[PDB]
Symmetry: D2
Subunit: 436 residues, 4 copies
Amino acid sequence: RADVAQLTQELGTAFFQQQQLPAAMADTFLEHLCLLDIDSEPVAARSTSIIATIGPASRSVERLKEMIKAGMNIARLNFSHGSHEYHAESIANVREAVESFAGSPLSYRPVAIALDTKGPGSGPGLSEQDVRDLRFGVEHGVDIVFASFVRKASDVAAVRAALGPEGHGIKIISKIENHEGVKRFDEILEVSDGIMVARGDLGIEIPAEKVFLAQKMMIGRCNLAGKPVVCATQMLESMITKPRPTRAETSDVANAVLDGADCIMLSGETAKGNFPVEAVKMQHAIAREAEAAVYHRQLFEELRRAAPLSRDPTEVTAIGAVEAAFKCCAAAIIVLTTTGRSAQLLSRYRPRAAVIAVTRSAQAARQVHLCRGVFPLLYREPPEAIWADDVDRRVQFGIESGKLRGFLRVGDLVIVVTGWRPGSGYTNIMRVLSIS
Amino acid sequence: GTAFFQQQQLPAAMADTFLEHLCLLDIDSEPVAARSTSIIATIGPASRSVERLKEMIKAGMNIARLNFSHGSHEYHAESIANVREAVESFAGSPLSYRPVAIALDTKGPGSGPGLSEQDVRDLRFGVEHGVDIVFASFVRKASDVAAVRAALGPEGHGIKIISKIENHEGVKRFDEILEVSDGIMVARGDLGIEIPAEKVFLAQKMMIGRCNLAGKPVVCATQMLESMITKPRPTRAETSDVANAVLDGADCIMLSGETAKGNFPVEAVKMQHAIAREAEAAVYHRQLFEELRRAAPLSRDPTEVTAIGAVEAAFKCCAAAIIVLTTTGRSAQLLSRYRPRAAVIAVTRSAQAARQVHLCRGVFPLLYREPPEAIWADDVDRRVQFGIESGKLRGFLRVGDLVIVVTGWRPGSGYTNIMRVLSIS
Amino acid sequence: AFFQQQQLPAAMADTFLEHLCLLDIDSEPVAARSTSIIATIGPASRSVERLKEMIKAGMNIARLNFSHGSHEYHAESIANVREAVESFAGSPLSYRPVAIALDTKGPGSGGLSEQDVRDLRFGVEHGVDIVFASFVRKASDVAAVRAALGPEGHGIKIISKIENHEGVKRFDEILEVSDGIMVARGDLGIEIPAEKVFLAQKMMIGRCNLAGKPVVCATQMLESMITKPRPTRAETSDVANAVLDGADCIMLSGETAKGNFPVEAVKMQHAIAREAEAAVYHRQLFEELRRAAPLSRDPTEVTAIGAVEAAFKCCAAAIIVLTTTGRSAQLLSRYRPRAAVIAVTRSAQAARQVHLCRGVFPLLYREPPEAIWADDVDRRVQFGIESGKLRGFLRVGDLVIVVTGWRPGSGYTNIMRVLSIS
Amino acid sequence: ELGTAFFQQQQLPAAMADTFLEHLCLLDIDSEPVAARSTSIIATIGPASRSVERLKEMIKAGMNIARLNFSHGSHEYHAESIANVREAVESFAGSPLSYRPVAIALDTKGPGPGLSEQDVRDLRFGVEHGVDIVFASFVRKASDVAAVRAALGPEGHGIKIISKIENHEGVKRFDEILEVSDGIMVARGDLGIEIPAEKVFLAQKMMIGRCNLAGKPVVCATQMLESMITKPRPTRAETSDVANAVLDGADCIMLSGETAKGNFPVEAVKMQHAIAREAEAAVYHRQLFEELRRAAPLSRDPTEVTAIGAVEAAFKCCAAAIIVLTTTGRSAQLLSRYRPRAAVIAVTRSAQAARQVHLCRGVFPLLYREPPEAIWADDVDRRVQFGIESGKLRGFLRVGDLVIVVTGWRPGSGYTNIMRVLSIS
Ligand SMILES: O=S(=O)(NCc1ccc(S(=O)(=O)c2ccc(O)c(O)c2)cc1)c1cc(O)c(O)cc1-c1ccc(O)cc1
Ligand SMILES: O=S(=O)(NCc1ccc(S(=O)(=O)c2ccc(O)c(O)c2)cc1)c1cc(O)c(O)cc1-c1ccc(O)cc1
Ligand SMILES: O=P(O)(O)OC[C@H]1O[C@](O)(COP(=O)(O)O)[C@@H](O)[C@@H]1O
Ligand SMILES: O=P(O)(O)OC[C@H]1O[C@](O)(COP(=O)(O)O)[C@@H](O)[C@@H]1O
Ligand SMILES: O=P(O)(O)OC[C@H]1O[C@](O)(COP(=O)(O)O)[C@@H](O)[C@@H]1O
Ligand SMILES: O=P(O)(O)OC[C@H]1O[C@](O)(COP(=O)(O)O)[C@@H](O)[C@@H]1O
Ligand SMILES: O=C([O-])C(=O)[O-]
Ligand SMILES: O=C([O-])C(=O)[O-]
Ligand SMILES: O=C([O-])C(=O)[O-]
Ligand SMILES: O=C([O-])C(=O)[O-]
Ligand SMILES: [K+]
Ligand SMILES: [K+]
Ligand SMILES: [K+]
Ligand SMILES: [K+]
Ligand SMILES: [Mg+2]
Ligand SMILES: [Mg+2]
Ligand SMILES: [Mg+2]
Ligand SMILES: [Mg+2]
């Protein structure tokens, strides 16, 4: 009790009963489980991003506005079906729906566009259709590529080459779908930006009863590497026809979040199903409950112990900031980022505090949805003459936007992460600020 | 040998952190141990045939559930007769005979405040037909359990009562319910309609953790392989759900419509068997055993003291099994609560105890039918030899394996106090 | 080569047993000695020439035992210590602040005695930094010492000496109102059974470490060195184990006050302390200290834990902190970082007093204030870095953690920065 | 059942702590030790401690092993010292409460490029006079131990060789020396002159840790209570040194000049006894047992498997003792390696094994001299009851207490494989 007594007196007992905080303070994993409480309500914003596949059930601008409101963060275009003309219209409709909320900069939500490739088929590597589809992706400014049937490091090098010199900023998420991809996982992860556990094909390529082992291992290795991992396929399958999911489906979504997935996905549930918006709402509801049930006490200790020593100041600042956020139960960590990297390094330590990422890059704002707990804020104001004033204005934008979006209140403590000079790669400062 | 240490997720078992444990899980590391989590299959039109019941026993069914929400007493008496005929068709080979428990699942209170009149009549039918277990529907408080116990009468004192937690009140009054029950069922069907669907996993994980702390059986139930009612293969969420219920700590997993009315009852049992075996090997025993030991209170009961010593000894030598003699099942239950990797082979003369111990994870019951030897120590040795010979035939044991043998100092229940390290010859 | 020094193989061990098995007599210490040495001043160590050698040997705090000697005798001891200290001020690098501590005679058969009231008044008038209060039995004893120091002695640190059964039993209430504790083993070993003193020592050190308050281990640590040039095997073991237990300071009494080898006794404590500090099992220690320290909304407390976590992540050579009272350095010290805590301060008294906290290396800044406050902060940080390089704490390519505040005055530390040296 | 008073004694609040920091914070000077002193005391015999009357007082004060320093004195002088020790020990044979075996250890003069001529002759004298242990001076490599072993002739292969590590080479070649030795002595006198004085604590803690990991006895020696050669009370550093050697994990602690030539030999023994008892209660068994368990490799040796099961069982019930039957002392040594809080009462027919087991922390030997029963199980039961009755007489046991009993399945050394939980009647 002494470790939380003064803060319980200051913040109140009501604060410490919410968001599974009694289970979070437990000394063992067994006690953590025993203290999980269905009456302990989640308070934090939902941190695991939702990827929704766009199809006939979710293609209209009106339907896409409801999906964005329900929680969709990434729109997936499955290039296994449909023409380039069909996908270009889907992209235009997503952008029209997203930009319909841009009139209010303090609330606008960026939505990433991901292109999922058809795959190699019977071939040994990059197919001719994939080369044409990847060129379409670059020409239409997609943010992410979900590369199908990645079996080795040379497969991701071929995808990177097909994106050309103009597609250097596109994130490549390698889909692991067969035995070879699982066995060569380390070499694939090393050259990829992240991984997708593509359970549909994986469950037919390897015994169905072994898929959970591959999922848990790949999520663990991605968490260790600090790279995004997506759990995909049949998560809420019965909602293609029914308005409510099965008990196994809610369990599956909760367990993917507890395992450590940065993103969760919907395929037929949103592409062709009867209830696309309800499927997004269900993933949102479960993910929020599961995030609060994470046992941060052991998780943070293990992430620190396993993460190798680092001389990179962004990495050093990130661990200091996450430690500081846990010490004061900070509502948020506000970070300035150009590429998203400083926010990704905070996310890898799995803070309970929201990572509010302020950026001028529209593409980085879309791409950071791949990292658990990163909430992108697109800053549109022109630069101040004095760089230090421009930094301060962006920090104040994060604080004000946070206070006007549900994140912060007067008296809260916030951790602020910034750098010593302009340009990417120089994050080195952590500050503790009291919200006024 | 190096081959031994590559199987049953042993590289992941030796990891220093849970994160490293996850990183070392290997799809090529094959399970070797017998499947420890019992399978409960609900009986119905798809699984009432005596021939179909034989295939379900072979597939891995350990407990047959009779759902009294449907069907008359005459229907349920025929289901019981059919199950017993199928089970006893294998009695001619005592070394491979598999006991199968019969569980009666009550209709419930309905709109009433407590034990309904139909439940009183159904519980009396259960006692008259010798059922082993009662799955009591909609248990909301300790007095509900007392009412079930009273309705079983003086002849049903040995029947196990597993309380079904199906609503908010049952979750909130969980501790008082568990204290007077033999175990719990996380009845997710009704629970998922009584409380928000997105909160069921919290109730499941909490109840399994509390049952594991108490050393009492816990069952995970409903929609685990739902799509297999009409499809030959389950969804990715369904295999994940079964694996995660085992990893959470469930002693039993259940099939309802999948075996009672579906077109793939045998395949649904085979699928639960396959997933449970993989998940049991992926349990992180290093932290689990440390936490169970630390949370279990100090005890002056010799059965409890012997049980923790035997589990510790089994881990030290990678014992293939812990062979235990038991009259009521209690000595096997106390070994099971520490979650040994070694199979707990329980030798008993009680047909009812042999059926009931399927409620405890990792207990493999063997029904001993031979009349007693005149010298008690020789009778004890003959039962231990029966455990060994049954284990060899079934694949649990081989020549050269080490086993831990748990027995007592006098006949009768309650006197377990001896642990012995034995080499299989 | 880096990973073979300072017991780093033993530091990376997964269990305390493996940590012990990996301790290596060939693994040389590299870090600066963190546990301060308190030397009692007497006839063997009173001359200016002897005091210069004691400062060079490692003495950080000079103890004046008011159980013997007149006020005139102690005033001369103080003047000699200050003269020896300022003789190195010509070349600040060898300049090291030395605290002056007054150890009271005690209550005797009486609370606060009349002689103690007069001696505490003398302490305030002569600007002593610390009071070692004898025979503290309860919180009201500390309040009486505080009252006797008056309004001019508010800044003096009170270290309560626990010397009997009552002091041990009422430890929590005494620690709550004290700045720190001294395990006064001489009287403790006669007041309670001799075989129980180690229990009282280990308990008091553990509770002081939990509270983040300084604790001193004292008496008969190197006793045989009063007449012999080398200590016994039990004496070297005792010094090493006091450091391993968690003592912030170790002390010499007769060994330096009247013995034949005062300088050698200081050199021996320095040598043992450096070896013992490298043998600390930081892997479990940091985890336990980090878990036990309560959650806090105080920005200095929040910044301190963030800075120590950052230092461990990059094997930082030092944490440079700006401090007025020493508090920001004390909050970093409580987490027992392997990185040296280099404390830059303008307060000469704070520079002397921070020797009470393990691993705090004070640097006295004496330059005029810059017109722009941000530039004055930058100049002090640069002074910490350049002094760190000159003194051997830092080298090109090292990473340092820098801890500062958002406005002038004590209590506003809230910033941690990661900096690469040259 | 036990009472709140029981849980306030022997540092039990500090023993139940979840962290080492909380363990330290809970150490209490008012919590009195209750268990018998487990760390043996080795006293060096000389002019101050040679008379039969003085030796009787030293045995009463707690001396378990008598050390003969062959660096000084003739064979005739040492033979008379041995005769005086045996006469003093046998003067207590009339009382089963006061009788205690005392081991005799020969400490060699030392090396020269091989074993010295004087050491060959002194080792021969040791075999001829039936010494139990050799403390071999200046052991630098495994071949030095082989030379000592060869010098123990055809008759002294059962004598224990404790290698003294006294220089840099001995520390660097520690692993190869420990592998071939029965145990180690941290000989701090010479070690503190051969290596820098400020590094001796590192060598001590490393060697104690490695011996504890190997399950072999380790002795801490020299200048532990040095000032007591001329003063009636020790310094604060000296009491701290003795307490810290016990906390480090030393099986034995030693007195040299303090008992051989000092003015207070009996008081020095009394002081080591008093400090050792306090320090043993302050051991943090919770983390120590977990680490010893985790570091000890997996084993298929039934004696090793039984030992860890017995120690686990003893902790579960706060057992008053673990009674073990042993012929060579090995089964008692394997229980001792896991550092149980319970006393290990070792019943043996070997007078030599009874003296030698004083090298292992917490082993209390009982020499059994009854003629063997014709029925082996009756002979085993008689010895188990002999251990219980001796435990009652000595104050370890009372009616209602639980004890753990360790035996084997057949006669002869090497077959330990049984652990039983017994209630004292
Ligand atoms: O800290 S964690 O949340 N949990 C660590 C943890 C510790 C012990 C065990 S046990 O020994 O098998 C076990 C199981 C049930 C018992 O009743 C019990 O006593 C012990 C299982 C997990 C975490 C840590 C990680 O490093 C990580 O990568 C991910 C996660 C995690 C992964 C999966 C989740 O379902 C939730 C979180
Ligand atoms: O992390 S620590 O450095 N050491 C933690 C530690 C862990 C276990 C044990 S044990 O279970 O008794 C033990 C003893 C010997 C064995 O062979 C073995 O396997 C286990 C002893 C220490 C530390 C932690 C603290 O929180 C603290 O306040 C202080 C210290 C400490 C204090 C005194 C020291 O001698 C060194 C450090
Ligand atoms: O996360 P990234 O991509 O490294 O960006 C972090 C960068 O953002 C900043 O905080 C502000 O930089 P800009 O003013 O160029 O936007 C830098 O100081 C820091 O290097
Ligand atoms: O697990 P339970 O019901 O306590 O049964 C254990 C009992 O079984 C035995 O091993 C054998 O007893 P029986 O010969 O009566 O079958 C007893 O020694 C022991 O008390
Ligand atoms: O450790 P303390 O006593 O709180 O002092 C820390 C203070 O030192 C500073 O870094 C510098 O303050 P000054 O300019 O007044 O010396 C402040 O920003 C901070 O509040
Ligand atoms: O410790 P040791 O020397 O192996 O002796 C243990 C032996 O003692 C016994 O318990 C009793 O044997 P004995 O009857 O020959 O004395 C054996 O069963 C066991 O093998
Ligand atoms: O491609 C996919 O998403 C799959 O197979 O799951
Ligand atoms: O009753 C049940 O089995 C349920 O509701 O899950
Ligand atoms: O007063 C003291 O310093 C003592 O008793 O140790
Ligand atoms: O020989 C010894 O005992 C020593 O040197 O300490
Ligand atoms: K595709
Ligand atoms: K029912
Ligand atoms: K004094
Ligand atoms: K000698
Ligand atoms: Mg696919
Ligand atoms: Mg129901
Ligand atoms: Mg005193
Ligand atoms: Mg010597």
